[PDB]
């Protein structure tokens, strides 16, 4: 079964009560889809996910037959705190001697309280124009646990950073890294730079070269 799901970077603006994600089967076989939405935080310097009722997906399960197009409604049950970007993960499970494969899409989802937006629309860009911290503000530090080396990234801004390439010239085997707003995360590294790291952020409308200074 050929499954098409978009958008894969959805968001709910401050003045929107819900957004939509499309589920479309272009194959010739039917598929079953389960939809869940988890709250996403980086407490404990790592990605944690939890059950939540703030964003309710409708429907929670759907049969997507050949040629069908269903809407997945993501609706806010309550209003979010002013000036805050809430992070979530949309999880949709696609089910069309042998070993067969079924799909699972982990999709980033962001919802916005008053006075802050995604920045991918003109209206949300104006909202963030009136907000100084409506961007990622990143700091790094390297402290080495039991007993390897780990890179720490801190975000002091009110919006997330989606980082792709780091270093100063690149860490293969790292497609992306998320540093959520008002959060700190750590990674697995080696080598020495002992300054400020150079990175690329894909959070906004275009790939911006973002500078991240060392914590000291």
């Amino acid at each position: 079964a050929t499954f098409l799901i978009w958008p894969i970077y959805p968001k709910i603006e401050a003045n929107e009560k819900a957004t939509a994600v499309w589920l479309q089967n272009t194959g010739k076989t039917d598929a079953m889809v389960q939809i869940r939405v988890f709250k996403w935080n980086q407490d404990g310097l790592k990605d944690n996910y939890s059950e939540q009722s703030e964003i309710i997906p409708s429907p929670p399960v759907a049969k997507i037959k050949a040629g069908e197009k269903h809407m997945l409604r993501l609706t806010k049950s309550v209003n979010l705190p002013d000036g805050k970007e809430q992070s979530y993960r949309l999880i949709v499970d696609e089910l069309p001697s042998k070993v067969s494969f079924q799909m699972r899409y982990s999709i980033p989802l962001f919802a916005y309280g008053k006075g802050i937006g995604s920045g991918l629309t003109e209206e949300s860009q104006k909202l963030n124009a009136k907000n100084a911290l409506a961007k990622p503000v990143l700091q790094w530090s390297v402290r080495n646990q039991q007993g390897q080396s780990e890179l720490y990234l801190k975000n002091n801004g009110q919006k997330f950073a989606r980082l792709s390439a780091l270093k100063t010239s690149s860490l293969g085997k790292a497609a992306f890294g998320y540093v959520l707003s008002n959060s700190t995360v750590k990674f697995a590294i080696d080598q020495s730079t002992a300054s400020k790291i150079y990175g690329v952020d894909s959070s906004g409308i275009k790939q911006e070269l973002i500078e991240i200074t060392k914590m000291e």
């Binding site: 001697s97 042998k98 070993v99 494969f101 085997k173 409308i205």
Partner: protein, 291 residues
């Protein structure tokens, strides 16, 4: 009444691969002219002529220079072209006004196999239209009342289209990231115990869309993280390429057979781990794609 939009933006969003393979169906947007309270009695002729004074079928992404081409149509789904007026006056034209705002719709259509990176593709010029109209009004607002552009005369006063009223609006197409996954079955051989199988999984993603691909431990893990196929159970595992590196919970989209809309292909070998009799065992493994 009838009014003309002096400023405004219309936007459609399409995912990129679907755009390449299917184009985009006639999407309705606001022409610039809107009417509410029009009569639906079809008793009085609705005069309406437009002149497109400015328009572009080219849509440009400011940050790459890439472009999309679009067809624009006029609510009878007739292609509109600069430098040519079209009189749409009929008795039934009044039923094309759509939505609560009574927007007279235009349509945008994207054909072909246009392949472009995700981003905002803005019309190279705004859509500026001059309108000449006289629309019968519903009876409760008056008898014989019409919503008219400036200087209009329905006809000791001759018929006159007047000087017209100008609308102006911008058009934008947002191309969205998009990924397709194709993962076929791994079919082991006969029975009466099974050679390994080197297969592959394919992912066609839009250009700047990184991801991690993880595989779970199937429906019947035996000691927590040992994959096994259900008949008793038969233990197996999955390894990246032809190596001894277990593929599990992962594989970065940057690190497997990626040449250039991009396509990644992931080669993996499935091996039996144990004398254990036949046969016909099965498992289903979850492929998680994480953006």
């Amino acid at each position: 009444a009838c009014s003309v939009s002096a400023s405004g933006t219309s936007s459609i969003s399409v995912p990129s691969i679907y755009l390449m393979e299917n184009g985009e169906n006639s999407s309705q947007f606001n022409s610039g002219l809107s009417c509410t309270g029009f009569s639906l009695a079809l008793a009085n002729m609705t005069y309406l002529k437009y002149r497109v004074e400015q328009m572009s079928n080219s849509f440009t992404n400011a940050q790459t220079g890439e472009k999309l081409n679009a067809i624009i149509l006029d609510s009878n789904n007739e292609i509109i072209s600069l430098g040519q007026e079209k009189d749409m006056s009929s008795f039934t034209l009044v039923n094309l006004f759509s939505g609560p705002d009574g927007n007279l719709p235009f349509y945008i259509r994207l054909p072909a196999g246009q392949s472009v990176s995700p981003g905002v593709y803005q019309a190279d010029s705004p859509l500026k239209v001059k309108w000449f109209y006289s629309v019968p009004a519903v009876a409760i607002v008056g008898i014989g009342v019409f919503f008219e552009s400036p200087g209009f005369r329905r006809g000791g006063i001759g018929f006159n289209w007047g000087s017209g009223a100008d609308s102006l609006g911008s058009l934008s197409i947002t191309v969205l990231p998009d990924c397709r996954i194709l993962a076929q079955d791994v079919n082991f051989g006969t029975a009466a115990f099974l050679e390994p199988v080197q297969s592959s999984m394919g992912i066609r993603c839009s250009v700047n869309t990184p991801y991690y691909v993880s595989l779970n431990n199937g429906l019947s893990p035996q000691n927590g993280n040992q994959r096994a196929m259900k008949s008793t159970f038969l233990k197996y595992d999955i390894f990246k390429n032809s190596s001894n590196d277990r593929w599990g919970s992962r594989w970065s989209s940057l690190n497997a057979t990626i040449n250039p809309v991009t396509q990644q292909n992931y080669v993996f070998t499935t091996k039996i781990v144990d004398t254990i009799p036949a046969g016909t065992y099965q498992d289903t493994v979850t492929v998680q794609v994480e953006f």
